[model samples]
Target: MLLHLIYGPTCSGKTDMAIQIAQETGWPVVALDRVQCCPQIATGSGRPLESELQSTRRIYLDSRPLTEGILDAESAHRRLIFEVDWRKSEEGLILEGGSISLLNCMAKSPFWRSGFQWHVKRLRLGDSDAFLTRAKQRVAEMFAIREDRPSLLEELAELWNYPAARPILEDIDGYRCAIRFARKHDLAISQLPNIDAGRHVELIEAIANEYLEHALSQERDFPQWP
Candidate 1:
């Protein structure tokens, strides 16, 4: 019963909407970014705390007792969540940030094939220009915030990125592809603020619908679900 999965570009209000849904429904909200539960190895560059959060890096979401294959970023998440989804049906799950594209990558690999069941509740934020602006602003804010952390941003930035280098966060086409994948597959598609964000009651109703409806709408097609 994992109702309402929020997927969107940065500051498109994915986290904000997810928090609202969780608060209203009392469903435990889990950020897929927060699901990395692996000890990790040194790339010799020394990974930052965000190395865990960033999808470009590998991580394991191993829950109980942990498991192998978790050292590899992609495999670790698959194994852990597969176990959780299969064994923990009694409780509801809300996930964020695991790549649906990872499964696509896996399907092409001989080592991993025939992707698992994936259903993503979509979060459409109007336009690419809006999303891009938000993403850039977020990167700036994130860099500014990290300056306060002790060597948190520096360790990895030192290894690969220049202190002054401004990183581009996402591609317009990649995000468009995700939504297209969801629509094409008929996965549990959801649009937040579908009713009315301006009206409190309407907002609650729409979010409630997103939560309740998306929870059990699996088996349509596996785009990506965490």
Candidate 2:
């Protein structure tokens, strides 16, 4: 079988590209993300909407509740294998996410390295300033009020009431900032906090570099694969 791995930093259009490829090739997309697996934090995690999932045939490898614990790379890898085997798609499979740990695990694993033909697409914004600008806009949009769905702040507010959910969500990017802002303003969803685009971009770049480095090393080690 063939596997298409579309990976990049946050807000890098990885999911959008995956869906497009899946649509064109009739392949199923499997999410390898850590936060997106939790149903309660969908808004903050940026999981594809139900409509998008239905249309693109995307499947999340880990759908366990955050209270149970975040899915580790080993478990995600196991689930990935199971999902691939279960699908048995002749067209191919598309795996997409920004999980560096999961990517590292897959890179080093002999099982994954040899099992399938790999096509790796590492999405990136060439200009750092432009990337930060785009990220700031994306964060603003997450907090924007919409008639169609709950805003990230609203979602975080409700989740804050759940003790278990708080700990889990407090670590994620958008939710982390939202929690702090809510505490400072007493659950004011309308007031937009001064977003720290620099810090956010720093963290994202650190993770992106890890993903890039792992892929580079894997390519060097296994000359035949990506």
Candidate 3:
């Protein structure tokens, strides 16, 4: 079976794209966000991760204390839908996350390594200064647009803080990660920069094919086997 990992910066529409790819390619989504987004609790209901995420106040990881398991590679739920057969249209997993570098960091670690197809895309808006501003704007707009989705999750007071200072579900610009990954592995992720919808589909297919070939050539380290 082949494994596929999707990477992009904050608000590049990776989540929506994952949904689209799942429908178009008939692949189950492997939620990587659950890994980073999961709570890094400091002891409580034994579910510090969940509590930390739900807290109204910002829970900064750089400073937050952890009184639990060794920050393991496994996420809270550790759920990822993997392909059953590589011959099944060359599809595998679809992982979603805001930080491409962080994912890359994990993929290179001893604890985790997804020998899957890496489909990296980005919506970079230049430097970090611009990126931060655009992300905060999305926070206000998302509340205004998606506040009635039944979940109706209110805007937390921890709206715009560093590290988490980006669009929760929109306005993602990306770069650096894809470029670095390509340079490191010399795999062709994108043909050129500044991609449109048409170009995106074409480039994504390239990434998919490349990763599928890689998966077939090696042993993948994901989707626990029985």
Candidate 4:
């Protein structure tokens, strides 16, 4: 069976694409994001909704926490290997995230490199200006008020009370912006402050550049394994 790997930067629709593919095909989806594994920051991490999760079997979403050490690339790779072996899917697997380092580890590991047929799709939203505009809109949507769910600021405010979750939340793109906006305005999370699109775009670009650089310098043709 073929393993589908969808890679891209933040707000580039990686998870959405993965869900669509999983719905069309019967393959299980595994998230490769380091932050989305934590439930506390679901809004900040861009985790799929309950409806989306029901579309297919999903692995790693809300499976880890900030109290534990952050899920680094190597550990994520190990967990992925274990899941792939245990799940036993005939339709193949869909792995998706913007975690470039994790992708690099998987590409370099002999186990993944030689064990399965791999298909990789790298998503991009065109040039830097285009990406910045899209990212700004995405960040706005994260904080947008919704009747059914807490906004990103609300979630981050709750997480802020916990010391362990604070550092982690401060590092994430959406949460970081929300935190700054709240602190600047001296407003409660219940009162939504305007997210600073400029800062959010800067954070996103820094993250995306890593993937862009890796894709340019390191990506190569995958050899089919027997």
Candidate 5:
């Protein structure tokens, strides 16, 4: 089973691609959203739709405050690895989200070094005004549907205005790091000509197919299962 990792920004239309892949390849979707890791949290995104898809599942990791001595990002990632019911997927998994990058950071860890076809696909929309518009709209939708953090949500809305500054900037910074990491390591994740400002299910599939073609052509190195 080839464990597929879909990495992208909030507005990169990742959920749509995941659903499409599920339909096309009959693969179960594995949602790895940070907020959705916690129970009763209104991630207001993929949780509901992913639940509706049969056989697809989510790893419900605890997302309480770090200072509360609950979970750190690295531990949460490791926890997801332990909890995933990998046996359910005959063809591996279609895993997506920001946290996928965290998992990628552990590429040299024990599990990553063990036998498994690990494929990564990045949906980079580049730093363009159009991409920013899409990102802003996506963040707005999350805040709108959100039931938690009434006032702090408003702060995010305000911060969105100054995209070059504040919280929004951090997302961009992290994405840049993610992209560079993927490229420098020779894991170029099937690039698409700057994301179009419309529904991209088919387009994503098309590019993903290209990635699959290349992925299937090579013999990746991995430690024998111990």
Candidate 6:
């Protein structure tokens, strides 16, 4: 598989879309986000190493064996190169994540220069208020699940203090950077239907079918993959 890199901010429906595409195509979905992969990131914030107390389990680093030491921008970019090189499959890959650094890291590589075909999809979770509300709610649920671990719970509670509007704005800036990278690299970019009209998984599934079908049909124009 070549790669389908779908990127969006927290609470964006990127995962659902990736799952829908994977289910239809029978491909395994890979989580390539720097923040999400580290199960120790109780707040799902990118600042995972701000404190020495932020103990991390290497196992949760989804691209395990590829990412280590610091989870900073440089490390994440370095990890992207190694992970993508190591995990290139004969079939198509579906990678969805929320890390702008990971995307920036990915664009630095010459993967496309190797004749690999790729597709890019940007999922917008709506305006900041809606997204922050959604993100906070999800984190709250995660906080509840980790109640048995009080230290972790205490750390996650800091998420409530995050300014509801700022990071989302920063993410939008990052999202634009990703779009520019996609255009620069010649990766086909897909514009998804607006979810603000109504947020529904069924709608997402339908969009996935259309999007993946378009992507795979184009595969016929190139050298076929196993």
Alpha-carbon shift of residue 153 in model 3 (angstroms): 7.5
TM-scores for all candidates: the values are: 0.42, 0.77, 0.39, 0.77, 0.52, 0.50
Model 4: residue 181 alpha-carbon error in angstroms: 3.6
- Which segments of candidate 3 are over 4 A away from where they belong? 35-90, 99-105, 110-118, 127-137, 145-226
18-96: candidate 4 lDDT, tens digit per residue: 8889888978788887777877667667777776566577778337766675687788888888878776657599988
Q: Write model 2 residue lDDT over 96-204, tens digit each, in one string.
A: 8877777777777677757578888877555656666666565555556667657666676666667887787767666665556556546453343333555434433
* Candidate 2 off by > 4 Å: 51-54, 184-225
TM-score of 3: 0.39
Model 3: per-residue lDDT, tens digit, 1-226?
4444555444345556666666666765544443233232111001122222332222112222122222233332222221123334654555454333345445555433344445554333345445445443432233232322211012111222223422331121112222333455554433333334554344334333333332232223222121
> In angstroms, how far off is 72's CA in candidate 1?
4.3
Would you list the rank order by lDDT, best first? 2, 4, 5, 6, 1, 3
What are the lDDT scores of the predictions, listed in order?
A: 0.36, 0.68, 0.35, 0.67, 0.47, 0.45
lDDT of 5 at 201: 37
RMSD of each: 15.6, 5.8, 16.6, 5.0, 12.6, 14.6
**Which regions in candidate 5 have their CA more than 4 angstroms from the true location?**
39-41, 44-56, 63-70, 85-89, 143-226
At residue 147, give the lDDT of candidate 2: 74
- Looking at model 2, residue 209 earns an lDDT score of 43
TM-score of 1: 0.42
Angstrom error at residue 213, model 5: 33
Better of 2 and 5 by lDDT: 2
Point out the worst 10-residue segment of candidate 1 by lDDT.
165-174
